[PDB]
Amino acid sequence: VRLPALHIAARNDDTRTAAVLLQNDPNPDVLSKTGFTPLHIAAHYENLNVAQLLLNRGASVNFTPQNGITPLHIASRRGNVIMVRLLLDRGAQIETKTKDELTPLHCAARNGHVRISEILLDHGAPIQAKTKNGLSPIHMAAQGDHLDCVRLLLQYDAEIDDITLDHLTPLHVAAHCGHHRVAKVLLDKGAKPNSRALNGFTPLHIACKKNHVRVMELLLKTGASIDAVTESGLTPLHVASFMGHLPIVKNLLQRGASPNVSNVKVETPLHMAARAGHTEVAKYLLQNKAKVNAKAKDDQTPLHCAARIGHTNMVKLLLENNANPNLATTAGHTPLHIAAREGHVETVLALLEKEASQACMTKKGFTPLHVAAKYGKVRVAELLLERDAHPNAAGKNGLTPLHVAVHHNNLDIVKLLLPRGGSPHSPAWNGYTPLHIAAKQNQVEVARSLLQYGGSANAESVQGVTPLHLAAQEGHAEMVALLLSKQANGNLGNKSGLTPLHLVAQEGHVPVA
């Protein structure tokens, strides 16, 4: 687990120990466990004397380990100007690539070594060489905020609009990393300000995504399009409002960016600031032009988007300005419906304080109380029933909130609806009562609550079917015994005369019979 003695001598620049070792063992290219020769160590630490000794004793100046890191690569990465010179005079190859296709110029430019980069360029290094991801040395210089390296590479006729495999120009990289000085040099040297990435992202889009305000001002000063869209229709205000960067949003709106723009999903910048919860960005959007009641796909408002995530103070902000809670989607869902689905009690309370109508019904026929009863939201149902909610509201199908609480097996909603007015004697379109559903689904505890509040076990459907008929047909012996102790008639027949024993015979449950 210790290094070979020649590596240790190379690290310490000990030429006497190295000379003794090479007199004993004449191999200067002894390999460590990682496969690095002592020349690699000498190039890393810029130990000139031991490097000259090793090269005079026959060390491979162009040694290539499995990862392809030559000593010239290490000297260029570390900034060892004198070692780079010495290796170049002894025959170091200038175009050799690593496993990720990095040249020594890539290593020099990534770490911003201007002198080394100029030395390699003067020896014929390829300035347009690419890595596995298509990064030229100017990309690596722009990524590291190496202003003078970018300047030197541009002076050596590097392509200012070279793209990576992701179609990223050096301006794109400068905008992504927030290096406004590199971006300034590139744009003053003629870089295109509206270059498109793979997803149609301009450098302005990336600057507005990462809250890089100085890059944004520098781009807009040099003729970047403020209304440029991506493939999805994203404006820089859509990106800034979604990410919540208030300085970017304020600067874009001050300069005259349109705030009522839409994308494929017909979403607006206020929609993305409601769906993300940035109340201050949305507040500034509404001070300027913004349609608070604007509609997207599926007829969704920013109130719909704010109610889904449950961010309460945005709901209060949107509602206080001009938002109308009674607006509904294509499926008929008002923001009260969405808030009741996710159990957002504070959002429901804020919506209800601003005249949200619980009488609004979806296409299926569901009030917000229905949705709470379907999804088991007992805090929302408690708050709705507290303030003007009809427990026996029904649509065309006749389903009440008690129907959908029993159907989805929400005991807490059932135990909350019954004392407040949820009637057990409410028939559906087919005449089914809430006790009909419990008896079929073997909800014994729900049935006990339904029976305790006056549920009738002999209530009949449109075809004469009682809950005892459904319990016996489904083979629920405990349900049948419960109903039979609450005045259920076991001899009662349906329209065709079928008794519960007939329905037991059809399916074959011995314990029920």
Binding site: V1, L3, R11, F36, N67, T98, T131, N133, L168
Partner: peptide
């Protein structure tokens, strides 16, 4: 102290093999 660099693990850490690689090209898909 003053002798940790003589070992293969420490020298591998010192040589920083990750700086001779293309790390990634992040996009941060929104």
């Amino acid at each position: 102290e003053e002798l940790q660099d003589d070992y293969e693990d420490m020298m591998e850490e010192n040589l920083e093999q990750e700086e001779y690689e293309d790390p990634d090209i992040p996009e941060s898909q929104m």
